[PDB]
Amino acid sequence: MWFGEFGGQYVPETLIEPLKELEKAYKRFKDDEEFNRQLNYYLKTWAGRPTPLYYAKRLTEKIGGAKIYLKREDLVHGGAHKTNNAIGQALLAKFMGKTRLIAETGAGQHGVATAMAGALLGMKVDIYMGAEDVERQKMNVFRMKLLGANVIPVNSGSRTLKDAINEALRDWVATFEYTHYLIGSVVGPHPYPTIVRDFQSVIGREAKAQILEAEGQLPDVIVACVGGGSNAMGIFYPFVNDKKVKLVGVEAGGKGLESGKHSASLNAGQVGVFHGMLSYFLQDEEGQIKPTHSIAPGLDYPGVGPEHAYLKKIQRAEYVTVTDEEALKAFHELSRTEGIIPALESAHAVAYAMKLAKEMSRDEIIIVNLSGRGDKDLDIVLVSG
Amino acid sequence: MWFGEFGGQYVPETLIEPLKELEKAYKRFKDDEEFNRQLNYYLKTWAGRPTPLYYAKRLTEKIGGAKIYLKREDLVHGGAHKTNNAIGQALLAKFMGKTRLIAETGAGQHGVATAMAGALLGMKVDIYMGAEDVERQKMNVFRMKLLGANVIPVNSGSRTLKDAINEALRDWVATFEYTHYLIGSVVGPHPYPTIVRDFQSVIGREAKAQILEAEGQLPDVIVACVGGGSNAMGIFYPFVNDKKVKLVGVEAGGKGLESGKHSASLNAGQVGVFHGMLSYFLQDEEGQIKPTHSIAPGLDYPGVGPEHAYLKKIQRAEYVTVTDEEALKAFHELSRTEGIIPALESAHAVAYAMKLAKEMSRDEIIIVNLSGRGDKDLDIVLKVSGN
Ligand SMILES: *Cc1c(COP(=O)(O)O)cnc(C)c1O
Ligand SMILES: *Cc1c(COP(=O)(O)O)cnc(C)c1O
Numbered sequence: 001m002w003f004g005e006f007g008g009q010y011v012p013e014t015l016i017e018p019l020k021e022l023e024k025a026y027k028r029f030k031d032d033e034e035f036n037r038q039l040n041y042y043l044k045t046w047a048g049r050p051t052p053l054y055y056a057k058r059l060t061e062k063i064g065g066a067k068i069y070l071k072r073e074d075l076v077h078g079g080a081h082k083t084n085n086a087i088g089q090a091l092l093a094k095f096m097g098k099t100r101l102i103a104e105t106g107a108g109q110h111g112v113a114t115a116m117a118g119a120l121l122g123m124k125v126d127i128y129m130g131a132e133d134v135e136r137q138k139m140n141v142f143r144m145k146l147l148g149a150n151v152i153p154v155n156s157g158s159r160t161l162k163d164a165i166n167e168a169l170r171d172w173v174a175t176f177e178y179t180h181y182l183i184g185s186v187v188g189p190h191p192y193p194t195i196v197r198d199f200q201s202v203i204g205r206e207a208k209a210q211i212l213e214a215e216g217q218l219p220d221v222i223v224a225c226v227g228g229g230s231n232a233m234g235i236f237y238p239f240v241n242d243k244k245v246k247l248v249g250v251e252a253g254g255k256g257l258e259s260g261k262h263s264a265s266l267n268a269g270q271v272g273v274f275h276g277m278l279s280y281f282l283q284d285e286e287g288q289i290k291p292t293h294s295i296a297p298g299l300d301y302p303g304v305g306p307e308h309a310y311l312k313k314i315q316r317a318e319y320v321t322v323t324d325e326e327a328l329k330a331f332h333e334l335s336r337t338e339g340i341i342p343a344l345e346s347a348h349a350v351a352y353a354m355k356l357a358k359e360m361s362r363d364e365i366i367i368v369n370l371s372g373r374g375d376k377d378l379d380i381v382l383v384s385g
Numbered sequence: 386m387w388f389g390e391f392g393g394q395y396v397p398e399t400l401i402e403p404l405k406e407l408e409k410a411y412k413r414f415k416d417d418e419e420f421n422r423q424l425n426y427y428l429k430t431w432a433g434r435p436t437p438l439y440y441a442k443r444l445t446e447k448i449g450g451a452k453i454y455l456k457r458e459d460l461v462h463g464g465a466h467k468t469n470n471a472i473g474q475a476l477l478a479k480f481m482g483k484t485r486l487i488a489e490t491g492a493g494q495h496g497v498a499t500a501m502a503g504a505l506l507g508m509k510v511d512i513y514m515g516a517e518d519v520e521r522q523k524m525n526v527f528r529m530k531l532l533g534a535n536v537i538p539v540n541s542g543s544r545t546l547k548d549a550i551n552e553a554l555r556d557w558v559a560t561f562e563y564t565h566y567l568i569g570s571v572v573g574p575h576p577y578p579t580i581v582r583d584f585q586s587v588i589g590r591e592a593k594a595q596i597l598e599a600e601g602q603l604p605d606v607i608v609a610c611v612g613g614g615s616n617a618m619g620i621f622y623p624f625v626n627d628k629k630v631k632l633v634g635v636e637a638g639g640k641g642l643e644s645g646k647h648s649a650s651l652n653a654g655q656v657g658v659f660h661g662m663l664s665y666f667l668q669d670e671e672g673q674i675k676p677t678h679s680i681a682p683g684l685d686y687p688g689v690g691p692e693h694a695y696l697k698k699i700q701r702a703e704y705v706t707v708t709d710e711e712a713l714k715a716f717h718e719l720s721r722t723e724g725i726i727p728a729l730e731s732a733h734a735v736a737y738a739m740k741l742a743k744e745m746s747r748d749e750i751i752i753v754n755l756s757g758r759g760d761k762d763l764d765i766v767l768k769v770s771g772n
C-alpha cells in the first residue's frame with residue numbers, strides 16, 4: 001500500500017469493504033493457473049501481444065547520437081497500452097463473478113479501452129465522463145457507444161474528470177456487489193496503483209527480452225511519457241533493479257512550466273490527497289484540483305501515481321517535461337522519419353529521447369515507450385493548420 | 386503472366402522496358418538471402434507480423450453455427466493488410482536502386498500505406514489521386530502529408546482514380562530510371578498481379594499454421610472481401626491446392642446488384658482491358674470505366690485482379706456480394722460483440738461469413754480475413770448511422 005510516504009487508501013468507510021474484497025481476489029488470482037492462462041490467451045489472440053521493439057535507424061542517424069528503440073505499444077489492439085490493464089481488471093472482475101464494469105475517463109481513451117474489454121468479455125459497461133469532456137471528445141464517446149458501452153455525462157461540479165471520479169466512486173459504493181471499478185492508471189486507493197502496474201509490466205518484460213536479443217545488453221536509458229504513469233511503470237518496473245538502467249519519465253510542459261498551463265504534477269505539483277491516494281497533484285492555493293493543459297489528451301490527469309512520486313524521492317528515476325510545441329514537433333518527425341504516427345502523449349517521450357540521444361554516444365541504447373498510435377490525434381493536430 | 390486468359394501486359398511500348406526490368410529484378414530478389422532477411426526484419430519489428438488468429442467465440446455462439454475465426458490483419462501497422470505489399474515493393478525498389486516511389490490511390494488507403502513504407506526507407510513518395518477523391522478523403526490526404534508524401538491532385542478527365550492511374554503511368558514512363566511504380570492490389574500489367582499476391586500470401590501461411598494449432602485441421606471456408614483482390618489472394622493462395630478448403634470472395638453489393646449502384650466486377654462486370662490487364666471491369670455501354678459505389682472506400686476499384694477472374698472461371702473459388710446495409714450491420718455487430726471495430730471493407734466479409742455460419746454445423750471452421758480496422762471509417766459511419 002505504501003511506496004515510501006506515497007499511496008494509501010484515503011477512502012470513506014463505505015469503500016473499505018469492496019477494496020478489501022478486490023485486494024483479496026487479486027491476491028489469490030494474481031498467480032492462479034487458469035486466470036493467467038486466460039489472460040495470456042486474450043492478450044495474445046485478441047490484443048496481439050507481444051508488440052515488437054523497433055529500432056528507429058533513420059531517426060537515430062539523423063541525430064547522430066545514441067540508438068533510439070521504440071517499444072511499439074502503438075500496435076496493440078486499440079492503439080494504446082491501456083488495453084493491457086483493461087483486459088486484466090476486466091478478466092479479474094469476471095473471475096470475481098462481476099457482470100458490470102464502470103470507469104471514469106477524461107479524454108475518453110480509458111473509457112474506450114474499458115468498453116473494448118467489457119465487450120470482449122460480455123460485461124455491461126458504464127462510463128462516467130465530465131460533460132465538459134463529453135462535448136470535447138465526440139469521437140471517443142461515439143467509439144465507446146459502438147463498442148456497446150453507456151456514456152454517462154456528469155454535469156455536477158465543474159463537469160470535468162474529478163467530477164466523473166466522484167460519480168464513479170458513488171456508483172461503486174452501491175453496486176460493487178456485481179460492479180467492478182476499472183481504474184485506468186497507476187493511481188487511486190490501494191490496491192489499484194499496484195494492480196495497474198502489474199498488468200502493464202508485461203511491456204517491460206518483453207522490452208527487456210527483446211533488447212537483449214537485439215543488443216545482447218540492457219539499455220542505458222528508458223524514456224516514457226507520464227500522465228497517471230501507467231505506461232511508464234509498465235516498462236520501468238522490470239528494470240528497477242538493474243541499477244545501470246536509467247529511467248526517465250516525461251510530463252506535459254504544456255505552454256511552459258512557468259505559464260501555469262501544463263500538467264506536470266511531479267515537477268510543479270504539491271503533495272496532497274486525491275482519488276484516494278497521497279501523491280503529487282496540481283492544486284490551487286485552496287487545495288482544490290487545478291487544471292491541466294497539454295496538446296496530449298491523455299496527459300490530463302491532475303496528478304501522478306504514488307510509485308512515481310516514490311521513485312522520484314529515492315532518485316531511482318528522473319522526471320522531466322516537454323512543451324506542446326516540442327511534442328508536436330516530435331509527432332511530425334517520427335511520422336516523416338520512421339513512417340510511424342505516434343500518439344501525442346508518446347510524442348512527449350519521443351521529443352525528450354531525441355534531445356537525450358543527441359548528447360550521447362553512438363552505441364548507447366535508449367528505449368522509448370511508444371504508448372500509442374496517433375490516428376486519434378489527427379483532428380487536433382490538423383493546430384498545425 | 387497469364388491466369389487462364391486473364392492478365393497480360395496491355396501497355397504502351399514505352400512501358401515494356403521498365404516492366405521487364407522490374408520482372409527481372411523481382412526474379413532474382415524474390416528468394417535472395419539478404420532481401421528476404423530485410424523484408425522479414427521490417428515485417429516483424431515495424432509492421433508487427435505475425436498478426437494473430439482470433440476466435441470470435443461470442444459471435445459464433447450468438448449465431449449458433451460454424452466456428453468463426455478472424456485473421457487479424459487489422460492489427461498490422463497502419464491498420465490494414467496493404468502495408469504488407471507496400472513494404473515488399475518499397476524494399477524491392479530500394480534494392481533496385483530506386484529513390485522515388487509513385488502510386489495512385491482512390492480512397493487514399495494505398496496512398497497511406499505507400500507513404501509509410503517510403504518514410505520507413507527514406508524514399509521520396511508522390512501519390513496521384515483524383516481531385517474528386519482528394520476532396521472526399523481529407524483525413525487520408527493529411528495522413529499522407531504527415532508521412533512526408535506529396536499528394537498530387539489530378540483534375541484531368543473525370544478527376545477520379547482512372548485519371549490518377551493515367552498520370553501515374555505517365556510519370557513512370559519518364560522516371561522509371563530512379564522511380565518505382567508501387568501498385569496497391571493484385572492488378573495492373575505483369576508482373577504486378579504476381580508480385581502483390583506474393584507479398585500478401587504471408588497472410589495465408591500464418592493463418593494456415595495458426596488454424597492447425599488451434600483446430601489441428603484446415604478450415605471449411607475462407608472468406609475475404611474483394612476490391613482489387615489483394616487481401617483475398619494473400620489468404621487464399623496458401624490454400625489453393627487444399628481442395629477441401631472452400632474459398633469465398635465477397636464483392637461490394639452497395640445499394641443492391643440490380644440497382645447498378647455497386648462495385649461487383651466479378652458478379653456484374655464484363656471482360657475488358659484496363660490498367661494494363663485483361664480481366665473483369667465495370668464499364669458503360671461504351672467500354673468506358675463506370676463509376677462504382679460502396680460504403681466501403683477501399684472497394685472502389687472498378688475491376689478485379691486477373692487471378693480472381695481465373696479462379697472464378699475454373700470454379701476454384703466462389704464470389705458473392707454483400708450490400709452496404711449488410712456490411713454496416715456487421716460493422717456494428719463485431720464492435721459490440723467482440724470489441725473489434727472492423728474496416729467497412731472487412732465488414733463485407735464478416736457479414737457474409739455470419740450468414741454462411743448460421744447454415745453450418747458447430748464443428749465447422751470459417752476463417753474470415755479481417756483485412757483492416759475501422760478507426761478510419763468512424764466519420765462516415767457517424768454520418769450514416771448517427772448517434
Ligand atoms: C492514457 C495514455 C497515456 C497516459 O497515461 P499513463 O497512465 O500515464 O500511461 C499515455 N499514452 C497513451 C497512448 C495513452 O493512451
Ligand atoms: C484497400 C482495402 C481492401 C481492398 O483491396 P484488396 O486489394 O481487394 O485487398 C480491403 N480491405 C482493406 C482494409 C483495405 O484497406
Ligand code: NA
Nearest residue numbers: 612613650688
Ligand atoms: Na472489385
